[PDB]
Every structure is written in C-alpha cells, then in structure tokens.
Amino acid sequence: EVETFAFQAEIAQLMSLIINTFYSNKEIFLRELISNSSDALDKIRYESLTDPSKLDSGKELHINLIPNKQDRTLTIVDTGIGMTKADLINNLGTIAKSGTKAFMEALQAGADISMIGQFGVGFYSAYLVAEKVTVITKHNDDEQYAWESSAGGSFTVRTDTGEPMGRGTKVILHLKEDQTEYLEERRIKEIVKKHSQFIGYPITLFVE
Amino acid sequence: EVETFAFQAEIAQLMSLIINTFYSNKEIFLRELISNSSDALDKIRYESLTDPSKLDSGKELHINLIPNKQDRTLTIVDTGIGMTKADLINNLGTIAKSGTKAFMEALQAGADISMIGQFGVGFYSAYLVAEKVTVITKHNDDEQYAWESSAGGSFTVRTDTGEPMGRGTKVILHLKEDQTEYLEERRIKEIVKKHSQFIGYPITLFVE
Numbered sequence: 001e002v003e004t005f006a007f008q009a010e011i012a013q014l015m016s017l018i019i020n021t022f023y024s025n026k027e028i029f030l031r032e033l034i035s036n037s038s039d040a041l042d043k044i045r046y047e048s049l050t051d052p053s054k055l056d057s058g059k060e061l062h063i064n065l066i067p068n069k070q071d072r073t074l075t076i077v078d079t080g081i082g083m084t085k086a087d088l089i090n091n092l093g094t095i096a097k098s099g100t101k102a103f104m105e106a107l108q109a110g111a112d113i114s115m116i117g118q119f120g121v122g123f124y125s126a127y128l129v130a131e132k133v134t135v136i137t138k139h140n141d142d143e144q145y146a147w148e149s150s151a152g153g154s155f156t157v158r159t160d161t162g163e164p165m166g167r168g169t170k171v172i173l174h175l176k177e178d179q180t181e182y183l184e185e186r187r188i189k190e191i192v193k194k195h196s197q198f199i200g201y202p203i204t205l206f207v208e
Numbered sequence: 209e210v211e212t213f214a215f216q217a218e219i220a221q222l223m224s225l226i227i228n229t230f231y232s233n234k235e236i237f238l239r240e241l242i243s244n245s246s247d248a249l250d251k252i253r254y255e256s257l258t259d260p261s262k263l264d265s266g267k268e269l270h271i272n273l274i275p276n277k278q279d280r281t282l283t284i285v286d287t288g289i290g291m292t293k294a295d296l297i298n299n300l301g302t303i304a305k306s307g308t309k310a311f312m313e314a315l316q317a318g319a320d321i322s323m324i325g326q327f328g329v330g331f332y333s334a335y336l337v338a339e340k341v342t343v344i345t346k347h348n349d350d351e352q353y354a355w356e357s358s359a360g361g362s363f364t365v366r367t368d369t370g371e372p373m374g375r376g377t378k379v380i381l382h383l384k385e386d387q388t389e390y391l392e393e394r395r396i397k398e399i400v401k402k403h404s405q406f407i408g409y410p411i412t413l414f415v416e
C-alpha cells in the first residue's frame with residue numbers, strides 16, 4: 001500500500017512557518033481550499049465543453065462542507081477534475097517550489113499570510129488549523145488516491161480503497177484541539193459569507 | 209486565411225455592458241491581462257517540472273509591457289503555455305458562458321466591474337480601453353494564430369504568418385482615442401505597482 005516521500009525543502013519551510021508564526025486570522029484556510037475546489041470545477045467544466053462525456057463520472061459541479069464534531073474533522077468535497085497520482089506528488093498540482101520563493105520574499109517585506117493564495121500555495125494554509133490533512137482525489141484518467149501528511153518533512157500516497165467517488169477531491173481536515181470553532185455551523189456560514197460569497201458553484205454546509 | 213465566428217450571446221452582452229456602462233476606474237484591464245499571462249506562465253512551468261523539454265520553445269518566463277504612442281497600441285507579451293486554435297475559439301480558454309452568468313448576477317446585486325476577474329472573464333475588461341483587441345498566441349502543439357475582434361458580435365481567427373514567437377501570447381490593445389494615458393510610462397508603472405506588485409514573473413516596461 002503506502003509510499004513515503006519527502007517535501008521539497010522549501011515547502012517544508014513554508015509549512016514550518018505556517019505552524020510556528022504567531023498569526024490569529026486563521027479562518028482564511030477555508031477561502032483557500034474552496035477556492036481550489038472552484039479551480040478544479042472550472043477545469044472539468046472547461047473540458048466538458050469540447051468533450052461532454054468527460055462529465056460521465058458526475059454531471060453536477062458543487063462544493064459540500066461537512067463538519068463532524070465527533071471525529072474532529074472538517075471535510076470539503078467537490079466534484080471537480082481531480083488529480084493524478086503524479087499531480088499529488090508534484091505538490092498537489094502547484095508550482096510550490098517557486099510560489100514559496102515568491103511568498104517567502106513577500107513576507108519579510110510587508111505581506112501577511114492571508115496573501116498565500118496569490119502565490120498558488122494556498123493549500124498549506126490548511127495547516128493553520130489541521131494537525132493532519134488527508135486529501136482523497138479521483139481524476140478520470142487514474143485510480144482514486146489518498147495523500148496524507150501531519151507535516152514534519154514527509155507525506156504519503158496510498159492508492160485508496162475507501163469509498164469510491166466518481167470524480168473530484170475531498171480534503172479531510174483533522175482539526176487541532178483548540179481549533180474546533182470551525183466545526184460550528186454559525187462560524188462556517190460566517191466565513192463563507194465573508195470570503196467565498198462569489199464562488200460560482202453551490203456550497204452546501206451540511207448539518208450534524 | 210480568415211474565419212468569422214459569433215460571440216456566444218451572453219459574452220456579447222458582457223462586452224456590450226463593458227462598452228456602455230459608465231465606469232471610471234478603467235485601469236484594472238491591466239491587472240486582468242497580466243494576471244492572465246501569470247496563469248499562462250504557471251502552466252508551462254507546471255508542465256516543465258515533469259517534461260523539461262516542453263520548455264524547448266523558450267526557457268525564460270516573463271511579461272513585457274510594450275507601449276507605442278504612434279500606432280496607438282499597448283502590447284502585453286508573455287512567454288507562457290499559449291493557446292490552441294480550439295482554445296481561442298472557446299472563449300480564450302475561459303468558461304465565459306457561465307462566468308458571465310455569475311458576473312451578471314453579481315452586478316445588479318452590489319458588485320462593480322473590478323470584480324470581473326473573480327468570474328474568470330477578466331479578459332474582456334480589455335474592452336474598457338481598446339476599440340480593437342488582437343490576441344496573437346503560439347502553443348507547443350499547434351501553429352501561431354491570431355484572434356481579433358472590435359466587438360459588435362463576432363471575432364476572427366486567422367492562422368498567423370507575422371513574426372514567429374516560439375511560445376506564449378501577445379495581446380495588442382488598439383487604444384481608444386481618449387484612453388492614451390495607458391501609453392504614458394508614468395501611468396503604467398503606477399498601475400502595475402498598485403495592482404500587480406505580487407506577480408511572480410519579471411514585468412518589463414519598455415520605453416519608447
């Protein structure tokens with residue numbers, strides 16, 4: 001099953017900076033992730049325009065936000081384009097090694113961590129709140145994989161045999177002990193209404 | 209040489225709204241276009257990571273801004289991924305038909321035209337200043353094309369036999385009579401310093 005890779009050295013600094021820096025405006029991790037879903041959904045819609053059967057694996061394009069106080073996870077599910085195992089290994093389809101240089105350069109010269117998405121490494125903002133992020137994803141041209149890391153230098157990539165999903169990506173956020181506010185329905189509706197009000201796909205906040 | 213297509217009916221409304229609406233903060237067309245370059249450069253860098261020879265058609269990734277008071281054009285040149293003729297026909301690789309619905313919905317309910325990029329139809333902001341936009345583009349898997357429209361319902365797509373470019377996209381903006389401020393070096397440096405200060409590729413403002 002499991003393979004264990006090392007984060008590129010600059011990404012590992014990024015994550016460390018994100019875990020360590022005192023910084024109180026954490027709610028943005030959501031914007032970043034929903035806004036990744038949105039991009040993922042854009043692409044499958046772009047692709048469907050010319051091949052309408054690429055949409056065979058789900059004809060409806062949406063984001064669901066699924067809280068679970070018990071398991072202590074927030075899960076964002078979308079039915080976008082998905083990634084290949086190769087994409088997941090290559091920094092979740094980002095240009096991370098260079099976005100971290102840009103971002104890094106930006107931080108000591110003014111910028112604050114909210115600006116992270118502007119460098120296309122918005123994903124790692126996940127680590128403002130999650131002590132463990134598992135990314136489950138299915139692309140049309142591949143098996144369903146699972147990506148996982150609790151940070152500290154290395155991530156993992158098993159092919160997944162959990163619940164098939166047809167197409168999209170699913171980010172389970174195993175939340176930090178003191179970060180459980182982002183499982184409260186009040187708080188999530190707030191953050192989405194504040195920061196993701198212009199996302200052109202429906203966003204369904206599940207209720208427990 | 210030339211083929212003549214019709215804008216999808218909703219895009220044609222978009223452009224008409226952009227030409228007609230009284231709206232004084234026009235300088236944003238630049239942000240939109242440079243920020244399209246940036247995305248185009250991201251992709252060829254993403255692609256080079258796994259195939260480093262895709263970069264054979266230019267190993268350096270950048271944006272040049274080239275003013276010409278004489279011809280009355282502003283030209284933005286980048287060496288990003290480029291588009292296929294199929295991409296250019298399909299709304300310059302956007303999901304325009306739906307981004308215009310989202311945008312449209314947003315406008316009557318608060319939003320102003322600066323928010324256009326958030327709907328992935330930021331290109332048309334070009335028509336806040338250009339009376340004619342010509343897009344010249346070369347992808348690795350195709351000939352160099354030219355896209356053109358002065359709006360009014362229809363655009364054009366010739367294969368291009370002007371100056372080869374290796375790889376990227378080039379948007380010549382044939383500027384409106386009273387919109388020549390965006391050929392002044394003062395003004396362009398301003399708009400870029402204000403709105404495109406965090407673009408992770410060099411931006412070279414040519415001098416006349």
Ligand SMILES: CCNC(=O)c1noc(-c2cc(Cl)c(O)cc2O)c1-c1ccc(CN2CCOCC2)cc1
Pocket residue numbers: 033034036037038039040041043078080081082083084087092093094095120121123137168169170171250
């Ligand atoms: C290669 C083709 N597939 C995709 O790009 C894809 N499929 O699924 C996702 C994705 C990624 C993440 Cl982190 C999510 O939280 C959700 C999601 O759908 C993605 C994304 C991966 C990465 C990114 C981040 N960017 C890619 C380039 O940098 C600008 C933003 C957005 C979406």
Ligand SMILES: CCNC(=O)c1noc(-c2cc(Cl)c(O)cc2O)c1-c1ccc(CN2CCOCC2)cc1
Pocket residue numbers: 042241242244245246247248249251286288289290291292295300301302303328329331345376377378379
């Ligand atoms: C299909 C693969 N190729 C490309 O995507 C590409 N190559 O070159 C460009 C491009 C487009 C425009 Cl309008 C420019 O001004 C510059 C440029 O490089 C592009 C772009 C086309 C369209 C867009 C607009 N978006 C695409 C999806 O919506 C979010 C932003 C950005 C870049």
